[PDB]
Amino acid sequence: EVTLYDLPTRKEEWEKKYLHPEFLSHLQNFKDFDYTEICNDVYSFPLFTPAFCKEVIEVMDKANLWSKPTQDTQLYEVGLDKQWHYVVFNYVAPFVRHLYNNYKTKDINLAFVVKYDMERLAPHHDSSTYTLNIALNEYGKEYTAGGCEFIRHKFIWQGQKVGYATIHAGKLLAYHRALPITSGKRYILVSFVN
Amino acid sequence: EVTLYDLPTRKEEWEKKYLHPEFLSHLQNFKDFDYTEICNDVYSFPLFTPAFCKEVIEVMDKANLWSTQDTQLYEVGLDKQWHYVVFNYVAPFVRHLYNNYKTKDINLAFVVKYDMERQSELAPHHDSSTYTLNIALNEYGKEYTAGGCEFIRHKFIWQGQKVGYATIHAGKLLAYHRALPITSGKRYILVSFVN
Ligand SMILES: [Fe+2]
Ligand SMILES: [Fe+2]
């Protein structure tokens, strides 16, 4: 049975179990891929399956390597940096070339899972060319409130579906802040890409 | 008597001669600064005087270090004057335009010369910068015709920029652009890639 770590050694089984079928079937034709521009130059799109999000959370909860600041754990702390590098350069980068006029992805700065809970958010620019934000658990069923305010766009984005990703410019044009949750737990996967 | 190189040794005289009066008079109050958003998140604004642009072209034409046909500012001893300009004058305006974004460092600063025998391969591209400054150094229609810039993502053609006016836009991701060919004369621009 394929696991999160079997990429790209078991690439075919990995894509079927972990990549969202709408994203996987549009790898070579993103023009008919159903993504949404939630505000100017900011896009929401299905990327990962619920099984991916569930197992990522399980790895992070089991490791208990959270920072003692925003509660997070780096992907490389659980041995998933090489798998994520493959995801970015082979799956995310072609979609970035489609969304942002053939922009070529250079390198990965950071990749981590953030856990918002009750026991544990200023406006800022990201240290990235573009930032990925994947919702790992379900709004309403597992947490309330939360989301992200794009300050410049005057647009608040909340209630992202499980496995859907939000992509936005890191610097200059996408000033933003995370908004707190009011109950439950909210897990997200964040990556800063140059 | 003050020259381009006398910054910041003769700062007051340098600002009066080389900084556009509209920009110089709004250094501490940018909300009333008459700049134009020509397309989404792309702004055109006056920055330099005709004397600045005239003297920069003279320095580049006399140096004849052209090798796009461009010359870097450090090749004529103007890089540190430009470093002062970006951090003391441009950086506060960038914070006003782009939600308090702090300027980190200057990647490149150079003057480009377009002419009939050297129009360059006007290919679409992103810039290796967070934001890019593009200052028009000579007069549209008088010293060259056509030319300009096309913002491909914005679907906006930008032509006929006035002398000493700057265009600022994102370098990566969100401002895919290309220069437009000239039909006569010579077109000089001052470009800086800033992180
Ligand atoms: Fe952020
Ligand atoms: Fe450019």
Numbering used by the authors:
A (entry chain B): 683 to 750, 767 to 818, 822 to 895
B (entry chain A): 683 to 749, 768 to 895
Paper's wording?
Fe2+ is coordinated by an active site amino acid triad (His825, Asp827 and His877). Tyr814 and Arg887 are positioned to bind the 2-OG C-5 carboxyl (inset). An enzymatic activity assay employing bovine skin collagen substrate to measure L230-induced conversion of 2-OG to succinate showed that activity was extinguished by mutation of Fe2+- and 2-OG-binding residues but not non-conserved Ala879. The L230 LH domain formed a tail-to-tail homodimer (889 Å2 interface) through loops in the DSBH core. L230 dimerization forms hydrophobic contacts between a leucine (L873) and an aromatic pocket formed by three tyrosines (Y798, Y801, and Y831) on the opposite subunit (inset, c). With a buried surface area of 268 Å2, the L873 residues lock into the aromatic pockets on adjacent subunits. L873D mutation caused loss of L230 dimerization and enzymatic activity on collagen but retained wild-type activity on a synthetic collagen peptide, suggesting that the mutant protein’s integrity was intact and that dimerization increases binding of lengthy collagen chains, which leads to increased apparent activity. A deep U-shaped surface cleft created by the dimerization was flanked by the active sites of each monomer, a unique architecture compared to other 2-OG-dependent oxygenase structures. Surprisingly, dimerization was lost following mutation of the Fe2+-binding ligands or Fe2+ removal, and dimerization was reconstituted by adding back Fe2+, whereas mutation of the predicted 2-OG-binding ligand did not lead to loss of dimerization, suggesting that Fe2+-binding stabilizes the dimer.
Although its sequence resembles invertebrate LHs, L230 has >35% homology to vertebrate LHs with similar predicted secondary structure and solvent-exposed regions. Our findings reveal features of the L230 active site and dimerization interface that are conserved in human LHs, show that L230 dimer assemblies are stabilized by Fe2+-binding, and demonstrate that L230 has telopeptidyl LH activity and promotes cancer metastasis. Collagen-like proteins and collagen-modifying enzymes have been detected in numerous pathogens, including mimivirus, and here we showed that mimiviral L230 has telopeptidyl LH activity, increases the formation of HLCCs, and promotes metastasis in an orthotopic lung tumor model.
